[PDB]
């Protein structure tokens, strides 16, 4: 069941992934891009190596991730959204050698319809 | 000099207002909607009554606000963006009976071009 987050090119896009903070307690999170139905879901960024510091923002290029383990909400920021960012992604909860899908996210990029010439 | 943030109807729009954390140290922040050139800028939501708790999210309906007083970044969340949310808004810094404008934000709501029927 895919969730669609739509953003405008040139702006930042914020993707939120709510989860049961009790069921995924103590688990680091990750964000990967799924290139096809059979994978790969290529790892882009994950939360801090210490679960206690999950609130600290981690970066990979223009992608950032931060985790509210209390309220149970994972947040991914796509800085300077571009058309080639469009596609399917996964929010993941990590435990050992396993990974549970929290949410399948479709990123859709809209062209900027405004003439900022001023 | 207004700054334009664009969001699609149904999505959550995130407005960011950077500011000099030293110039505005100890000041709570506010978010208001400016209905015309002569006002009013009707107060929508403000940060926590205690400035030390500025990081705690405050809500008024579908609008939330949180402040990073360390890095100097105020964040406004317009959840479930509607067409009537379009218009001009202000980021404000409060001290006593005064209010300094941090940024004038134009919110532009884009129609959802996707048919979500299944």
């Amino acid at each position, epitope marked *: 069941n*895919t969730t*669609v987050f*739509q953003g405008v090119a040139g702006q930042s896009l914020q993707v939120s992934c709510p989860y049961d903070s009790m069921k995924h307690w103590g688990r680091r999170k990750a964000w990967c891009r*799924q*290139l*096809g*139905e*059979k*994978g*790969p879901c290529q790892r882009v960024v994950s939360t801090h190596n210490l679960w206690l510091l999950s609130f600290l923002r981690r970066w990979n290029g223009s992608t950032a991730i931060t985790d509210d383990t209390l309220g149970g909400t994972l947040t991914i920021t796509l800085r300077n959204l571009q*058309p*080639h960012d*469009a*596609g*399917l992604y996964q929010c993941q909860s990590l435990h050992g050698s396993e990974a549970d899908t929290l949410r399948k996210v*479709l990123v*859709e*990029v*809209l*062209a900027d*319809p405004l003439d900022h010439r001023d | 000099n207004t700054t334009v943030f664009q969001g699609v109807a149904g999505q959550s729009l995130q407005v960011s207002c950077p500011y000099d954390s030293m110039k505005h140290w100890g000041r709570r922040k506010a978010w208001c909607r400016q209905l015309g050139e002569k006002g009013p800028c009707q107060r929508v939501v403000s940060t926590h009554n205690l400035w030390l708790l500025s990081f705690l999210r405050r809500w008024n309906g579908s609008t939330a606000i949180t402040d990073d007083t360390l890095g100097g970044t105020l964040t406004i969340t317009l959840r479930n963006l509607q067409p009537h949310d379009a218009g001009l808004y202000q980021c404000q810094s409060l001290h006593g009976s005064e209010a300094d404008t941090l940024r004038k934000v134009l919110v532009e709501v884009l129609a959802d*071009p*996707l*048919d*979500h*029927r*299944d």
Partner: single-chain antibody
Amino acid sequence: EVQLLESGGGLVQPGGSLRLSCAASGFTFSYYYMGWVRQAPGKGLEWVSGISPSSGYTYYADSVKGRFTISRDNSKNTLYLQMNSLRAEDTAVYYCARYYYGYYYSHMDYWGQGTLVTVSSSDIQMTQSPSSLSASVGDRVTITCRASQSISSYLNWYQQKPGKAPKLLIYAASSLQSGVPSRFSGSGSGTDFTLTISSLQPEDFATYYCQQSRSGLHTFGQGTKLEIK
């Protein structure tokens, strides 16, 4: 379950116009990029156009020279291709095709069956080697595809059996598409790529096309025909 059905093809005079249509069912049409591919009689696949879910992004092959316009109606699950100033080289079977989620780095995973158009009386080059290959049932077969510049891992392989619509085998250089027999595999990164059939089966005699998706214009290779030795 996923279905794509083209319409609008027929006979047309040079200089005339034609508007193709494609009805889609079995999936959330609004969530996918869509595209058109055409095939002149006796020639390989030529990628024509692609369009984003919001219609905000449209892409066109340079060989069309701006004469075509792609559009979509999300409320009616329909894709369109407007063709103006039709020429003799526009005579082809025109295929409707769905992209898997995204566009760049993606692949055309479902195809329509095509509609015939008869006209009466960024730029990466993809070259396949060889153009024709004779093999026997049970053989190991390797087909190569070379890109004029680096395309990283974003190469797809398609199969077209005689008298059939094309079909996706491999995406992202090495991922086997669902439902495709495991005797097919792919490899490569950068400019050099190979498709491999580990043991040839009778139904594998067909033509095979590579396609890059690193840029916005998803050009096909010229094709490799696999015939019976």
